[PDB]
Design a protein around this ligand. Structure first.
Ligand SMILES: OC[C@H]1O[C@H](O[C@H]2[C@H](O)[C@@H](O)[C@@H](O)O[C@@H]2CO)[C@H](O)[C@@H](O)[C@@H]1O
Lengths: 4, 508
């Protein structure tokens, strides 16, 4: 997934 | 013993005569010394399987017969044991509606169909056709009235128009419904839904109208017509409106075809009170006096009990109900009905709101009406947990971050899923596939949200520029529906309501  | 033992708990929908049913309860209580509690929880048709599957839930559940084949298939309903003398008391048609796999799985109570209800003072001669409604609305708007308001949030009320020119749910061939032959996306269904959408585009109806809004408008004399069933007549009687109940308008010269429902009472398969339930239903409710008590509260429609029906048969509103019923079709009771209703609900709402075209909305419904679905273990009053379908977007918990995934497979009656994180992974640029259970995912609802989370609610929300859901707290909600959040462990962050989910950690 894309993460912060 | 089970906590349920030694009393009766009965569930019935909030639009039915639950107070009348409790009067029947009191007669039973007087004779037996056993307590009866009637309840009308919201979404009871969805709640029942969850509680009955654990051996809990009400002893008796009331709903239209369409949902009972699914309950029976799932092992949630006891086979009922009326003798031949009792069976003789009810119309054979009504017993047929409560048969599943050749077994009686509920007691039939009454036949329901929608009719056109009209204000005789505003409209002494109601339209015979749907096509007449636009001009009538133009006429009535000049005096600050409207032609027609009915519930647009439940596909039941739009179905008569969808079916009129050829829409159907499941095709009946060789004594059975073919779950691979769905008719929600044919020319007839498209034509009917298009007419509805055009009514809305042309400001003759509002896509947001629901049961309560339409009822209030009709009963206050603001709209000249509504579409409703027998249960609604009591509230109209109490209002100052002079009303008639009549045949639904035709569409393209063909009758509207309402679904016919048989209100039915099932006995929970896990109930330790099956004999008490049988005594209540056979000896108290399904009698002239029992049905009269319920009917006096909210009309039942055309009752299953022959002796009492001979009276109701003369009511012009009942004649109209049966005329509409004859022009319609009996709902199937197959397990696929719940998937069908979710699909058609979504299509009607999305087309009415303009979010999707009629063709787009009905194509999706055709696909999903025939599909297996699941639900998240996690329930919330603010966000739906079903249906989780192939193509749904979910948050998935890897084995406090949750990741956005697409659903690829739903298997084992919705207890197991295959979900894919579509972002490139070291083990595949098309994304990583996981297998998971109901506790490991949350549904991201695909449609416009319906409810705000109260300030202070712990949530999982997608962080901007990520596809990961992180724990947060709701500070508040903007008018437009946007959530103002404080993310745990990081200015407040604004996140679209669609991307804000329940927190299983908080729920647990
Ligand atoms: O809208 C889908 C819904 O339709 C039927 O529910 C009816 C019910 O039969 C009526 O008695 C009354 O309560 O209005 C309901 C519609 O809001 C089906 O019986 C139900 O399973 C389905 O979800």
């Amino acid at each position: 997934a894309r993460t912060k | 013993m089970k906590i349920e033992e030694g009393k009766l708990v009965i569930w019935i929908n909030g639009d039915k005569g639950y107070n009348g049913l409790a009067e029947v309860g009191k007669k039973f209580e007087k004779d037996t010394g056993i307590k009866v509690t009637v309840e009308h929880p919201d979404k009871l048709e969805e709640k029942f399987p969850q509680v009955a599957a654990t051996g809990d839930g009400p002893d008796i559940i009331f709903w239209a017969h369409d949902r009972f084949g699914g309950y029976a298939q799932s092992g949630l309903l006891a086979e009922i044991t009326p003798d031949k003398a009792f069976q003789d008391k009810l119309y054979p048609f009504t017993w047929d509606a409560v048969r599943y796999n050749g077994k009686l799985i509920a007691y039939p109570i009454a036949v329901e169909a929608l009719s056109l209800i009209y204000n005789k003072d505003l409209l002494p001669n109601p339209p015979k056709t749907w096509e007449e409604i636009p001009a009538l609305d133009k006429e009535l708007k000049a005096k600050g009235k409207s032609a027609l308001m009915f519930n647009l949030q439940e596909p039941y009320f739009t179905w008569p128009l969808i079916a009129a020119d050829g829409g159907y749910a499941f095709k009946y061939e060789n004594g059975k419904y073919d779950i691979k032959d769905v008719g929600v996306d044919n020319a007839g269904a498209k034509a009917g839904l298009t007419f509805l959408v055009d009514l809305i585009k042309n400001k003759h109806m509002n896509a947001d109208t629901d049961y309560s809004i339409a009822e209030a408008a009709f009963n206050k004399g603001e709209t000249a017509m509504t579409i409703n069933g027998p249960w609604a007549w009591s509230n109209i009687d109490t209002s100052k409106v002079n009303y008639g109940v009549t045949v639904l308008p035709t569409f393209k010269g063909q009758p509207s075809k309402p679904f016919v429902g048989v209100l039915s009472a099932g006995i929970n398969a896990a109930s330790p009170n099956k004999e008490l339930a049988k005594e209540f239903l056979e000896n108290y409710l399904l009698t002239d006096e029992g049905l009269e008590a319920v009917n006096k509260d909210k009309p039942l429609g055309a009752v299953a009990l022959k002796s009492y029906e001979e009276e109701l048969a003369k009511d012009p509103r009942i004649a109209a109900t049966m005329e509409n019923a004859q022009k319609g079709e009996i709902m199937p009771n197959i397990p696929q009905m719940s998937a069908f209703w979710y699909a058609v609900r979504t299509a009607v709402i999305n087309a009415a709101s303009g979010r999707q075209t009629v063709d787009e909305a009905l194509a999706a419904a055709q696909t999903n009406a025939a599909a297996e679905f699941g639900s998240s273990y996690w329930t919330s009053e603010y966000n739906p947990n079903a249906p989780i379908l192939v193509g749904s977007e979910v948050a998935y918990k890897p084995r406090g971050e949750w990741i956005q995934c697409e659903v690829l497979k739903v298997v084992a009656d919705g207890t197991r899923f295959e979900v894919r994180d579509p972002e490139p992974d070291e083990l595949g640029n098309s994304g990583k596939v996981y297998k998971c259970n109901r506790k490991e995912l949350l549904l991201i609802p695909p449609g416009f949200p319906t409810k705000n989370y109260p300030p202070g609610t712990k949530v999982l929300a997608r962080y901007p520029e990520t596809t990961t859901f992180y724990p947060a707290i709701v500070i508040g909600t903007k008018r437009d529906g946007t959530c103002r959040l404080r993310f745990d462990g990081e200015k407040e962050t604004e996140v679209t309501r669609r991307l804000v989910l329940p927190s299983p950690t908080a729920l647990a």
